[PDB]
Design an enzyme around this catalytic site. Structure first.
Site, PDB file in Angstrom:
ATOM      1  N   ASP A 156     -30.894  35.793 -28.898  1.00  0.00           N
ATOM      2  CA  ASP A 156     -29.746  35.079 -28.308  1.00  0.00           C
ATOM      3  C   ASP A 156     -28.682  34.889 -29.387  1.00  0.00           C
ATOM      4  O   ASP A 156     -28.081  33.822 -29.484  1.00  0.00           O
ATOM      5  CB  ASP A 156     -30.214  33.728 -27.723  1.00  0.00           C
TER       6      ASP A 156
ATOM      7  N   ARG B 173     -21.752  31.061 -30.197  1.00  0.00           N
ATOM      8  CA  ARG B 173     -22.124  29.711 -29.769  1.00  0.00           C
ATOM      9  C   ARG B 173     -23.389  29.197 -30.452  1.00  0.00           C
ATOM     10  O   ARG B 173     -23.609  28.002 -30.530  1.00  0.00           O
ATOM     11  CB  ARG B 173     -22.291  29.613 -28.252  1.00  0.00           C
ATOM     12  N   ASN B 174     -24.227  30.091 -30.946  1.00  0.00           N
ATOM     13  CA  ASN B 174     -25.452  29.678 -31.651  1.00  0.00           C
ATOM     14  C   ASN B 174     -25.356  29.671 -33.173  1.00  0.00           C
ATOM     15  O   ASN B 174     -26.401  29.509 -33.878  1.00  0.00           O
ATOM     16  CB  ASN B 174     -26.613  30.558 -31.183  1.00  0.00           C
TER      17      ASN B 174
ATOM     18  N   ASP C  91     -30.744  27.910 -32.767  1.00  0.00           N
ATOM     19  CA  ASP C  91     -31.365  28.236 -31.484  1.00  0.00           C
ATOM     20  C   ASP C  91     -32.627  29.087 -31.646  1.00  0.00           C
ATOM     21  O   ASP C  91     -32.577  30.319 -31.560  1.00  0.00           O
ATOM     22  CB  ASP C  91     -30.402  28.927 -30.506  1.00  0.00           C
TER      23      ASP C  91
HETATM   24  C1  7X5 Z   1     -17.902  19.101 -34.464  1.00  0.00           C
HETATM   25  S1  7X5 Z   1     -18.944  17.741 -34.011  1.00  0.00           S
HETATM   26  O1  7X5 Z   1     -19.199  16.891 -35.164  1.00  0.00           O
HETATM   27  O2  7X5 Z   1     -18.351  17.145 -32.824  1.00  0.00           O
HETATM   28  C2  7X5 Z   1     -20.470  18.521 -33.547  1.00  0.00           C
HETATM   29  C3  7X5 Z   1     -20.733  18.789 -32.223  1.00  0.00           C
HETATM   30  C4  7X5 Z   1     -21.923  19.392 -31.888  1.00  0.00           C
HETATM   31  C5  7X5 Z   1     -22.837  19.707 -32.879  1.00  0.00           C
HETATM   32  C6  7X5 Z   1     -22.555  19.433 -34.200  1.00  0.00           C
HETATM   33  N1  7X5 Z   1     -23.429  19.716 -35.251  1.00  0.00           N
HETATM   34  C7  7X5 Z   1     -24.793  20.066 -35.233  1.00  0.00           C
HETATM   35  N2  7X5 Z   1     -25.321  20.077 -36.468  1.00  0.00           N
HETATM   36  C8  7X5 Z   1     -26.611  20.415 -36.576  1.00  0.00           C
HETATM   37  C9  7X5 Z   1     -27.372  20.736 -35.489  1.00  0.00           C
HETATM   38  C10 7X5 Z   1     -26.744  20.701 -34.249  1.00  0.00           C
HETATM   39  N3  7X5 Z   1     -27.468  21.019 -33.070  1.00  0.00           N
HETATM   40  C11 7X5 Z   1     -28.838  21.308 -33.050  1.00  0.00           C
HETATM   41  C12 7X5 Z   1     -29.311  22.564 -32.716  1.00  0.00           C
HETATM   42 CL1  7X5 Z   1     -28.169  23.808 -32.341  1.00  0.00          CL
HETATM   43  C13 7X5 Z   1     -30.671  22.833 -32.692  1.00  0.00           C
HETATM   44  C14 7X5 Z   1     -31.607  21.857 -32.977  1.00  0.00           C
HETATM   45  C15 7X5 Z   1     -31.124  20.610 -33.298  1.00  0.00           C
HETATM   46  C16 7X5 Z   1     -29.792  20.351 -33.341  1.00  0.00           C
HETATM   47  O3  7X5 Z   1     -29.517  19.050 -33.702  1.00  0.00           O
HETATM   48  C17 7X5 Z   1     -30.837  18.623 -34.099  1.00  0.00           C
HETATM   49  O4  7X5 Z   1     -31.884  19.510 -33.628  1.00  0.00           O
HETATM   50  N4  7X5 Z   1     -25.462  20.365 -34.106  1.00  0.00           N
HETATM   51  C18 7X5 Z   1     -21.364  18.841 -34.541  1.00  0.00           C
HETATM   52 MG    MG Z   2     -33.009  31.767 -28.155  1.00  0.00          MG
HETATM   53 MG    MG Z   3     -30.595  30.259 -26.298  1.00  0.00          MG
END
Ligand code: 7X5
Ligand code: MG
Ligand code: MG
Ligand code: MG
Length: 274
Positions: free
Chosen positions: A133, A137-138, A151
């Site tokens: 994937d 976006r990932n 992801d």
């Molecule tokens: C620009 S902002 O500060 O508004 C902002 C929005 C969304 C995500 C992040 N930033 C963000 N930073 C690290 C990880 C993630 N998302 C994510 C994933 Cl993809 C997979 C697993 C886990 C996650 O969080 C904990 O466990 N996101 C920052």
């Molecule tokens: Mg995947």
């Molecule tokens: Mg996926």
């Protein structure tokens, strides 16, 4: 790593994931300095299979250590909500980040982002992990513009399982992987070419309004995405190399990283645009 819930402070909800919210918070463990974390939460109303699916992303992330792969800090499983904690990537998802900053980063900056992604993938491929994937976006982006792959999960896609992982992401997916469900690091290389196009287009949607089946038929009929506006021809050619119909003819990730490193070393080469 089980994290004592008293070590975690949730600050703000910044996103939504498959199974619940994504938050910014702070982690403070005895003996270590406080750090910023992203927190995925899973609240009540979920089945045990779903809980295991949720936590599998943690298990997998925990198998890796690389500066271009999202780092796992830990999990909370002995209380509610169930949580996954990772490093915090201040700038979120690369596609939306680029759209917000359309035309505002240089080619060299964009090639540096692509190199970071390619190094993450080089690492995954070396570890015999096929992403499946790979899409802008990932990719998450930190305050220094470092790009990291996110992801992680090993669930078959809906098409691979019983007649009666989610659906295959057709626009990112290599033709042999759509047709035969043969997912390899070489199909990830196809996806990587799509990610290149996303980045150089500042987060435009691959294949615009074409239907999934329209994309499938176009690719079989030799169509390939054109160079984005102002895209260096050498980058577009690397994309086309990634999109070879014969998966064996595609560059492997060490070669992709090598190609990008040469561009960075020879930025004159990036001046040639169609
Ligand atoms: C620009 S902002 O500060 O508004 C902002 C929005 C969304 C995500 C992040 N930033 C963000 N930073 C690290 C990880 C993630 N998302 C994510 C994933 Cl993809 C997979 C697993 C886990 C996650 O969080 C904990 O466990 N996101 C920052
Ligand atoms: Mg995947
Ligand atoms: Mg996926
Ligand atoms: Mg544009």
């Amino acid at each position: 790593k089980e994290i004592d819930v008293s070590y975690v402070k949730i600050e703000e909800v910044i996103g939504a994931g498959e199974f619940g919210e994504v938050c910014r918070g702070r982690l403070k463990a005895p003996g270590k300095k406080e750090s910023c974390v992203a927190i995925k939460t899973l609240k009540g109303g979920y089945t045990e299979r779903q809980r295991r699916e949720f936590l599998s992303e943690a298990s997998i992330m925990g198998q890796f250590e690389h500066p271009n792969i999202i780092r796992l800090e830990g999990v909370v499983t002995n209380s509610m909500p169930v949580m996954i904690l990772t490093e915090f990537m201040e700038n979120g998802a690369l596609d939306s980040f680029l759209r917000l900053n359309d035309g505002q980063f240089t080619v060299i900056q964009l090639v540096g982002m692509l190199r970071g992604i390619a190094s993450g993938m080089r690492y995954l491929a070396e570890m015999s992990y096929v992403h499946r994937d790979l899409a802008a976006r990932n990719i998450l982006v930190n305050s220094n513009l470092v790009c990291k792959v996110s992801d992680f999960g090993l669930s078959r896609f809906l098409e691979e399982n019983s007649s009666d992982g989610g659906k295959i992401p057709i626009r990112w997916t290599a033709p042999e992987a759509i047709a035969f469900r043969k997912f390899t690091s070489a199909s990830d290389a196809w996806s990587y070419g799509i990610v290149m196009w996303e980045v150089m287009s500042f987060g435009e949607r691959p294949y615009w309004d074409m239907s999934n089946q329209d994309v499938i038929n176009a690719i079989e009929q030799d169509y390939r995405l054109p160079p984005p506006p102002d895209c260096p021809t050498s980058l577009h050619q690397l994309m086309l190399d990634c999109w070879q119909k014969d998966r064996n003819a595609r560059p492997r990730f060490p070669q992709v990283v090598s190609a990008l490193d040469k561009m960075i070393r020879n930025p004159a080469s990036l001046k040639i645009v169609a």
